[PDB]
Fold fructan 1-exohydrolase IIa.
Amino acid sequence: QIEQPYRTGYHFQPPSNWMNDPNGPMLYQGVYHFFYQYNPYAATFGDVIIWGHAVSYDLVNWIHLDPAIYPTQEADSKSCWSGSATILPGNIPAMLYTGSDSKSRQVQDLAWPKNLSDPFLREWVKHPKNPLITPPEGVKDDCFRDPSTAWLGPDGVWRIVVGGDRDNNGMAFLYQSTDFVNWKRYDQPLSSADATGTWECPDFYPVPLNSTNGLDTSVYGGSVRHVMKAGFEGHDWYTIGTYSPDRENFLPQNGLSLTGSTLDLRYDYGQFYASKSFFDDAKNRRVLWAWVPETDSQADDIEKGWAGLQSFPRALWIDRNGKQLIQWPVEEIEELRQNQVNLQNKNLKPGSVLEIHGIAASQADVTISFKLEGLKEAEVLDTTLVDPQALCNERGASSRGALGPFGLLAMASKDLKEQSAIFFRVFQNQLGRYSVLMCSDLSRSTVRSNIDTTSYGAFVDIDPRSEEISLRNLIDHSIIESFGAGGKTCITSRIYPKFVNNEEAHLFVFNNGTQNVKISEMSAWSMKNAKFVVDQS
Ligand SMILES: *[C@@H]1O[C@H](CO)[C@@H](O[C@@H]2O[C@H](CO)[C@@H](O[C@H]3O[C@H](CO)[C@@H](O)[C@H](O)[C@@H]3O)[C@H](O)[C@H]2NC(C)=O)[C@H](O)[C@H]1NC(C)=O
Ligand SMILES: *[C@@H]1O[C@H](CO)[C@@H](O[C@@H]2O[C@H](CO)[C@@H](O)[C@H](O)[C@H]2NC(C)=O)[C@H](O)[C@H]1NC(C)=O
Ligand SMILES: OC[C@H]1O[C@@](CO)(O[C@H]2O[C@H](CO)[C@@H](O)[C@H](O)[C@H]2O)[C@@H](O)[C@@H]1O
């Protein structure tokens, strides 16, 4: 019998109970601050949600503090929902969040540290005038929330967006202010989309072209593009475009309005929601946090006493081609690497399974690169309108193709009765052009009942002819984060195999295709636990 086999060893999560949306992340005076929607009374959502608070010097090891923002005014008497942090000139962290007032209205409130000499910013004070912003004209009281981090225009005016919808039409309501206290709604929203429902936790920020670095939220220029991110219809979507502060106009590069279809981009194609980023000026990088929901049952959560994880902080930047974003675990995670097991120039015959020995299979960092043999043998399949998730669910690791499925078997039991398969497939259209599919087959991840074992998939934008297909996996008990092609395609999975209660997990490399594939390089590292120190009461 193993105690709490589903808790992670290096992912952020509270000592116990329910946690969802990441809030107000930021770097202040050398300290990384992290906040999050928290229910201090149960392992499920509840009537009283507050901001949990933790600090870190490296984004890996944390110190849990007492909740920072909780009901104290009429403006947030019923709950303190999502918000963002903006460090104003003069070095004051300003927090804008959505509060549920005494009349159950979603309103935007302001708060800031009450003791800037405290490196951990434990105590916060609320602005006497809260709420600072209330639902506009024709917007429902429960469809106006999640203010973003603000950006200061060259005209000295601050901007922020607040999510919501007007008649089921997603909205990124734009507000302006010079003193950060008196805000005025701009005539038109920054962006929007028909019939998408409320836009949750919108994020708007710039990314430097031809650079793998991040930018302060207030930078603008021709060598900069902006990202409009919004959560709706159950997923986080984003679109790259150009921002004209003068006209408060956001023009999507592909000219499309978000539709929540295979036409739009996502940060992650698995369990990933309410993602929020912040700029780290110490390392000139933009860091992204995201809530990773549970996929087990509510009864399971109540029984184990907790629910919700945060994805591991990832650096974020725009690809050299300028058409999509790239994500990668922040370098500080590399410090958790212990012993290493490596493989090179290893052939994987059709229908073969190769076990990787010597690694702590439940807590590891695994990278593998495949060198393909005979691309022309790729199954012919035009994927212009194909839904990659549907395809992955239809063709799991047991569905044998020509090129694919080949990849990893993670959180697998000795006998393989339970396994999580992260793999690729290679296809070609009629004109000989290749496409690459990345799948997270969770269909056999557990023999347990009442577990959402839906699989996830996405197409990887690489040319198999000149690029080996690479895959990195962050394995941490009940969560697996997969990065294909250096972060071009990310998929986060939650799995709950039964075997982990009394036996060790295993790790395998496999190839169930009819074509041979070669492992050119494979690096696996056992990952030690991140430190979580409690400093409360
Ligand atoms: C690689 O592809 C194999 C061929 O599809 C796949 O086979 C597994 O074993 C047999 C076929 O050899 C099949 O299992 C069937 O029988 C069991 C009874 O124990 C049923 O419960 C299953 O539903 C199924 O009818 C399957 O095709 C497959 N087994 C399972 C669990 O589906 C291998 O498993 C594939 N290898 C990898 C690593 O995925
Ligand atoms: C504001 O923050 C400072 C810095 O943490 C607090 O000062 C510490 O207070 C504890 C308990 O009183 C002492 O043991 C430490 O030695 C103090 N350190 C410093 C830097 O002076 C201070 O108490 C906080 N102010 C309030 C009102 O709580
Ligand atoms: O915890 C509140 C936080 O949750 C989000 C997650 O997307 O929205 C959920 O909670 C709201 C308040 O109860 C609901 O109105 C909303 O429908 C639900 O999805 C965030 O939007 C919000 O800040």
